Every structure is written in structure tokens, then in C-alpha cells.
Amino acid sequence: MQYKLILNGKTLKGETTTEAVDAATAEKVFKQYFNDNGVDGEWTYDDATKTFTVTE
Amino acid sequence: MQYKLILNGKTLKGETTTEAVDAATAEKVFKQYFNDNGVDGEWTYDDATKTFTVTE
């Protein structure tokens, strides 16, 4: 299944997309790129659209 | 000035944006977020659109 990530920050902003077995594997992939580069933000998720949102 | 990044690959795809002093600082921010993440892709830049592109 396709999953999506929305990135909200002050140093950087963006949007990304991946395919994983489930929402926790896509959450694990998105956390590999987006945990401690500088963002260190608050996570949110909407299952009805398979989308994650990360906010500084 | 605003700079941009485009990500092409097999584990993640996407687009991101930053505001930096020069193309070298925008390249440094984008290389801090996109250092490896198992992509390890080829890097390209077009100055006429202030945009960087990364491909597997």
C-alpha cells in the first residue's frame, strides 16, 4: 500500500511518499529520514488518506 | 534566497524546499537531511531554477 509524509519546519519544508506492508512500516521508513536531522517535530496521522504530518 | 530539492528512488520519492544564504548552504541543508538513507543517489543542480535533483 502507498503511504505519504508532509513536512513542516523552519529550516526545511516538503512532501514525500513510499510503499510499505503497513502503516507502522511506512512510519518506520519515514522516521528513518525524519527524526534528528533538525526537525524533531510533533507527529500526526490520518488513516482515511494514508498520510502522516510532521510539525516543528 | 529560496532553494529546492527533488528526490527520485525505490524506497522514497518526494520534494523539499529551504531558504539559505547561497547554493552551498542550501546544498549543505539538503545533504544533512538526505545524507544517505540507503538512497545514496547521484546529485544534480540547475541554477536557472535554484533546484537540486537526487536520483537512484
UniProtKB/Swiss-Prot annotation, chains A, B:
| Intracellular or extracellular location(s) | Secreted, Cell wall
Could you tell me which residues the sequence repeats occupy?
3-56
Q: What does this protein do?
A: Binds to the constant Fc region of IgG with high affinity.
Name-wise, this protein is: Immunoglobulin G-binding protein G
Q: Which residues of the full protein are shown?
A: 229 to 282 of 448
